[PDB]
């Protein structure tokens, strides 16, 4: 299934942050990315892998972090993920066997059950772990997201964009973020 | 754990890894966990209310409280058995229908005035020989949430955090 | 162990002890610094217990200095890249010798520090060189508690272990 | 070959912080180095073995770290890594066998490649370790440059600088960051 997908779909904290949420007086005043993970999200794009992302906390901060990804499908400050799902999978005109989930919570049940593939981080609690297809043994945050797209792009004989210097600078034009 | 009704939690090194991180006009920023907000949630929506007790006051504590919608506190005070009292009446409850969760010497005479207690995994050994449950979780990094999950698996409500269509009551 | 009972004044390095190291950085130089709230309290029990606290910091900041109030230290050198020679400038402050002195540090720049005092102590993610050097090597990381660990050490030592150990114990000094 | 490294250039993100991006509603606001790396720049540079700097980012908070450890060759905001060490280089009066890199990830592959010796962060991907000459045992961001500059001077006979009070004290004037 790995070699399918033609989406991925990533919930943002302990996923693409290792869960800490860096309050000021007035919300959150940072939000964390990892930079390899960055990267892992525009190699996905330049294999035509389309990416989206759902959070339930909404910030002016995670809206910009996805627009300098690029990324234009997402639902965020939504609690029912099940539901953005299949919207988004809409959105991206692919199928829920072409998409693939990573989560680290209970509130993602839900998105692993309406994605074909899912992924929890390597924190993730034991019952959220229990429910996905892979637990990824990098921790959320850490570059999770990242393990992940490097195995589905393996699958899908592309390792050389990441894996040796020639393959990557046939694509660095895209690498950006 | 069957009969707890209120929880009661420390601050620095509980919700937080004990970094504090400073401008030159004192904290700047405090780092919460978020599966540890969803775990008060999940206390909170299985009618078990939910304290902070913290020594330290700052307006970035006070909206992390109000963002999660957390009712009761006690902000500024180093004498936490007090503390504790105070806010166990103000909750309606027993001291041995409330637990606490520390991580210091502070919060030894809060585990004494509650009937159960918690410590986080990177306590030191003093702290962690008092408590009724040493957690695993580092604090920080989701022991509010180790607590949580498991007095909701005590009280037979493992299913609001543990299966999706558990979840998808709430 | 003999040392530490006799123990009047612990002067402590900044960065890499009472933080993890890192310098966060904005366009105008160090804009965050992270210090360890359990550290905050070791501090609080040295004073209470009649040790001083003095900061040993090569780096000066307006951040440094906010934190310094906070925790009510009074002596402090920053500002000054050779520690020997503010190691006893400190000692002269603080009305102590050498001998009743003691020192933690992370890294290379401390190891005049060491020398310095009577006593030293490197925390657990000193490299080997700096542990090498000191008297006690801690097995806590910088920035996560490793002045605590070393604060708990020394009045374990002068046999007031009470003032953390316990809940009457403690009750006496908040 | 370490004896002969007269040239040091250093990845920036992954390797003199741990990877994260720390954002802000208007991009990254806080760049996160380590004071150990700081000070093994210093001793390399008091050592006559120049230090620079290669980042496919550029940035304000970027400069202001370089200007505080006065670090006069850089290129950032190149994401094509190779050109840029030779340009490096060049511009060090060094030769690339007497050069040495150290990177975190893909972005970095030629840039080992171009370089005599290279070094990867404890944390990088298998297929970046695979590639050096020397996996680091310290995670980017927690001294693995201070790990690898402490390497070349010992290797040097340079280590007195910083495992002696005496050999510190000698070269304290040039220790600041
Ligand atoms: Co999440
Ligand atoms: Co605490
Ligand atoms: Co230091
Ligand atoms: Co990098
Ligand atoms: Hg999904
Ligand atoms: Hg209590
Ligand atoms: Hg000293
Ligand atoms: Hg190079």
Known sequence: KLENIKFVITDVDGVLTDG????DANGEAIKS???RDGLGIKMLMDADIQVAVLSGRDSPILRRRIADLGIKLFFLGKLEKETACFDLMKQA?????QTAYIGDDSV???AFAACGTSFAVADAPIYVKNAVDHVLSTHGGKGAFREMSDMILQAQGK???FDTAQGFLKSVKSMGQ
Not at 93 to 97: F, I, K, N, R
Request: hydrophobic content about 40%.
């Open 20 to 23: 800490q949420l860096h309050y």
């Open 33 to 35: 990315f990892h930079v």
């Open 93 to 97: 005109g692919v199928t829920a066997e």
């Open 108 to 110: 993602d049940l839900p």
């Open 159 to 161: 390792s050389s964009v």
